[PDB]
Structure 1
Amino acid sequence: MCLKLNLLDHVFANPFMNAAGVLCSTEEDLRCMTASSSGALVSKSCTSAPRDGNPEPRYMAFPLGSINSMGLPNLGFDFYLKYASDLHDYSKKPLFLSISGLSVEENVAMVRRLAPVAQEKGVLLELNLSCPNVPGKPQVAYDFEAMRTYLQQVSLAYGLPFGVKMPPYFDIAHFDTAAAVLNEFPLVKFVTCVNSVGNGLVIDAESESVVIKPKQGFGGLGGKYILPTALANVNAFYRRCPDKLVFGCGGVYSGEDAFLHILAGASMVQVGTALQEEGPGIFTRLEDELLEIMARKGYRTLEEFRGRVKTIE
């Protein structure tokens, strides 16, 4: 009875890792994630230039989840790359590195210099497609031409196995089109579903006011709000992309939450809000909780139920 996984030529103690942007921006953050009992870790998405991001407050949490418009605050590519090549203990766990370039050029430039270190040290790319292109156009993964572009281009400049962080979709036709595009690109070896449910609005009854300063309160949604949505996308893409892995992300608070993610076809399982709220010790609970579930049912490895969600007569 174990949680072990092998994939993308790496061995993982458990399938629990953090969601990009949570406890992973600084060297302090990263050492703390590595000192944790997480299976993996992933660095805050990067741009070439360091960024402050939006004005505060810009993230808040509640009984049922969180809202954020951080605006991509990070220390710049050069730091995260240097953490990859010099500072990270791969013997502790594998590392993923997230890039969120604000144009296709910026993403190409970074991966080109990531390439050698990916090859030499084993760090794994999560390309963040749930990012903004030209303002007044939809975020990139909602714009399938821009999506095709980004993947052809990055593929060519990286030429190594990599994964993509996707936003939630809500129409079948979008599921259909998006997976087909992704299936064009053999180097895309995993798909991460899902990013924040975009542009929700949280209002405080007492003060009669939005809770985050940027975009007139509007922001990305996570936590218990987005779980079914996330199980939908995970299982959507699990079904439509049998040559890729899906990594689940969306409202994981509990072993049962992960158990359902895996049932839907999740290989790795990321924790965002719930981790921001409870902190890094969340990962020992999640492990134990899931293993109690597995015990109750007589499951001994994860593959014994991954993708094995039943449907009805």
Structure 2
Amino acid sequence: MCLKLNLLDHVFANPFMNAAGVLCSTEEDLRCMTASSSGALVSKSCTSAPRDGNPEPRYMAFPLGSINSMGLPNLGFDFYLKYASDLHDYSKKPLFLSISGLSVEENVAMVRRLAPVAQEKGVLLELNLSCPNVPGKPQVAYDFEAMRTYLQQVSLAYGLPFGVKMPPYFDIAHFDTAAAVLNEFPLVKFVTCVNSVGNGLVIDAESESVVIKPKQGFGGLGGKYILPTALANVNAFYRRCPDKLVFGCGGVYSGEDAFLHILAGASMVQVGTALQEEGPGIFTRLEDELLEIMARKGYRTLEEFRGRVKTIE
């Protein structure tokens, strides 16, 4: 009975990893995630220049999940590139490095410089498409002409397998078009579904107030609120992108939640909100809980049930 996976030319002890943005902004964080029993880790989405991000409070969590408008606080690309090329212990577990440039040119400049490090050390790129373009236009993955442009230019500039982090879609027509854009880029080898459910609004009844400061309290939703949304997107892309891997992310608190992602078609399973809340010890629990479910069901590996969600008739 084992949780091991071999994909993208790397070996993973188990499918669990942090979600970009959680426990991965500083050297301390990355060392902590590397010391954990996670199967991999991903760095905070970075920009060319370091950013302080939005004013606080900018993250809050509640029994059913979390709202955040962090605003891409990060130490800058040069720090994450240096962690990848000089500080990370690849003998421990593999590393993904997330990039979230604020223009297509910014992203190009960062991937050109990541490419030699990726080829030499085996760092894996996750391009964050669930991200600001021109303000008053939708985020990049909700503008399919912008998305095509970003994938065209990053494909050219990077030249190596990479993956994309995608926002949730809610319309079948959007699933169709999005997968068809992604399917034009043979270097996109993995798709991470999903980023936060955008622009939710949490109000505290006692104080009659929003709970985060940026954007009049509007921010992205994570946690229990979003598990069915995240399962739908994992499965919609698993079905439409047969030549690609799908990583699942959204609402994972337990081995049972991970198991459902995996049934939906997930390879890797990321943990955001619950990890932010419980801390890195969560990975032992999730591993134990998932193995307990496999044992009861007689499953010995993950490939025996990945993507095998049953439909009715």
Tell whether the structures are fold-level matches, with TM greater than 0.5: yes
- Determine the C-alpha separation between the residues in 2 that align with 1:105 and 1:246: 27
Identity %: 100
Q: CA deviation at 1:148?
A: 0.1
Q: CA deviation at 1:92?
A: 0.1
Superimposed CA distance per residue, residues 77-136 of structure 1 (whole angstroms, 9 cap, x where no aligned partner): 000000000000000000000000000000000000000000000000000000000000
- Determine the C-alpha separation between the residues in 1 that align with 2:307 and 2:282: 25
- Determine the C-alpha separation between the residues in 1 that align with 2:209 and 2:68: 15
Residue 2, structure 1, aligned to residue 2, structure 2: yes
Q: CA deviation at 1:5?
A: 0.1
- Aligned residue for 1:89, secondary structure, equals coil
Q: CA deviation at 1:41?
A: 0.2
Residue 105, structure 1, aligned to residue 105, structure 2: yes
Q: Any stretches of 5+ residues in structure 2 without a counterpart? A: none
- Determine the C-alpha separation between the residues in 1 that align with 2:55 and 2:297: 48
Superimposed CA distance per residue, residues 174-212 of structure 1 (whole angstroms, 9 cap, x where no aligned partner): 000000000000000000000000000000000000000
Q: CA deviation at 1:169?
A: 0.2
- Determine the C-alpha separation between the residues in 2 that align with 1:308 and 1:196: 25
Alignment of 1:19-168 (within 5 A): 19-168=19-168
- Determine the C-alpha separation between the residues in 2 that align with 1:140 and 1:158: 19
Q: CA deviation at 1:222?
A: 0.2
Q: CA deviation at 1:267?
A: 0.2
Superimposed CA distance per residue, residues 38-60 of structure 1 (whole angstroms, 9 cap, x where no aligned partner): 00000000000000000000000
Q: CA deviation at 1:308?
A: 0.2
TM-score after normalising by structure 1? 1.00
Q: CA deviation at 1:306?
A: 0.2
- Determine the C-alpha separation between the residues in 2 that align with 1:312 and 1:251: 24
Corresponding position of 1:227 = 227
Q: CA deviation at 1:310?
A: 0.1
Superimposed CA distance per residue, residues 199-255 of structure 1 (whole angstroms, 9 cap, x where no aligned partner): 000000000000000000000000000000000000000000000000000000000
- Determine the C-alpha separation between the residues in 1 that align with 2:7 and 2:156: 23
- Aligned residue for 1:44, secondary structure, equals coil
- Aligned residue for 2:45, secondary structure, equals strand
- Determine the C-alpha separation between the residues in 2 that align with 1:198 and 1:139: 10
- Determine the C-alpha separation between the residues in 2 that align with 1:267 and 1:156: 26
- Determine the C-alpha separation between the residues in 1 that align with 2:105 and 2:148: 14
Q: CA deviation at 1:69?
A: 0.2
Q: CA deviation at 1:258?
A: 0.2
